Amino acid sequence: GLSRVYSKLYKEAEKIKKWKVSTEAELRQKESKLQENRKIIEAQRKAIQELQFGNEKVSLKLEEGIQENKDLIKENNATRHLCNLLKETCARSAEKTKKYEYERE
Amino acid sequence: GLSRVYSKLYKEAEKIKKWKVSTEAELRQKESKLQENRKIIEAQRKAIQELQFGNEKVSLKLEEGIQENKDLIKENNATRHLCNLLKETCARSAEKTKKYEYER
Amino acid sequence: GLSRVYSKLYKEAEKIKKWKVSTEAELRQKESKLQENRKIIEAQRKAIQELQFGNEKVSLKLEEGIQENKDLIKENNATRHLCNLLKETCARSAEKTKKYEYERE
Amino acid sequence: GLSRVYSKLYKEAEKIKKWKVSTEAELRQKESKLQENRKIIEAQRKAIQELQFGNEKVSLKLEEGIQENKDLIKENNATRHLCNLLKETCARSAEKTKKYEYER
Ligand SMILES: [Cl-]
Ligand SMILES: [Cl-]
Ligand SMILES: [Cl-]
Ligand SMILES: [Cl-]
Numbered sequence A, C: 001g002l003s004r005v006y007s008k009l010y011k012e013a014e015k016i017k018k019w020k021v022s023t024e025a026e027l028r029q030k031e032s033k034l035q036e037n038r039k040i041i042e043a044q045r046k047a048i049q050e051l052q053f054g055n056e057k058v059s060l061k062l063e064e065g066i067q068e069n070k071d072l073i074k075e076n077n078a079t080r081h082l083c084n085l086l087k088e089t090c091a092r093s094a095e096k097t098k099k100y101e102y103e104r105e
Numbered sequence B, D: 001g002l003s004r005v006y007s008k009l010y011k012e013a014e015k016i017k018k019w020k021v022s023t024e025a026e027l028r029q030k031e032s033k034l035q036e037n038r039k040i041i042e043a044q045r046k047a048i049q050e051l052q053f054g055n056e057k058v059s060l061k062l063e064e065g066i067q068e069n070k071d072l073i074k075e076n077n078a079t080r081h082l083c084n085l086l087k088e089t090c091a092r093s094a095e096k097t098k099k100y101e102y103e104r
Helices: A002-104 B002-103 C002-104 D002-103
Strands: none
Touching: A002 B002, A002 C002, A002 D002, B002 C002, C002 D002
């Protein structure tokens, strides 16, 4: 009569201890995972920082090269134009030279 | 005496329930923190991948430009040489004309 | 789960209080009956003492009367015997008296 | 900690059982005392009845004896009176005889 009540009372005590041990373990496991993930987050931030720095370097070099190549195309076109002008000058000069050569004979 | 028994049993069971609620609350709080962290970590992993991929592309385009620059230098050199030849022909031809015109 | 255990625990407490109150009442009731019966026993002892004293008185009076009556029967028998002797004496005397009366005539 | 719970529950239930046994023992002890008393009280009640009945009988026999004593006194008185009459007749007759014998 009274022993069955104490027996069930002891069992509830057992269940409470188990629930306490389990929840404490789970809480510590979550806390340890939080501290791990915060170290990972900081490592990733530093990795991103260095990658953004490298991207800036190479992007600047690319833009400088693009502009330098645009200038070379411009200069070459201009020298080609000058070549064509000099050919015109040669043509008129050569024509006069031939006239004088023939006339003096 | 007997209401004491009733009262102490009531308060003990109430304390146990309170203790259960508080523990489950703290568990759900830490779990939400873990979820937020996992979302940040994933977003940063993506950003890292895209930065690595972008660095690669820009490097490749830089190599292409360096090669184009070489070819353009060769082209400008050849056009300069032709230009100088034409300049010499012009000057020599102009002085010849001036001489012929003086004589006549 | 835990409330049913505490409820049954409270009930066992109720049963224990009732058992305590009942057994205490019964014990006091028995003690009060003991004290009553001891007063009765002493009263009866004194009643018996006086009855034995009265019996002795009346028994003595009875025995004295019995003996006194036995003596009266004895005395009466003896006086009857003496009467018969005196009658014998009268008979012999009267016989002689008659002789003398007749002879002197 | 947990064996503490087991131990305290065990000792408490043991104390309760002890307390129950002691109470029932004291009850049976007082009950046996009440039985002994009821047997003494009954025996004394019987003795009282028999003493009252005996007193009555002896008183009645005493009354009978007193009456017998009266009748015996009357009888002795009558026998004495007759005895005295006979004594007178004897004495008177004896002196007469003595006189007659002197004369003759
Ligand atoms: Cl050309
Ligand atoms: Cl042109
Ligand atoms: Cl007679
Ligand atoms: Cl006789």
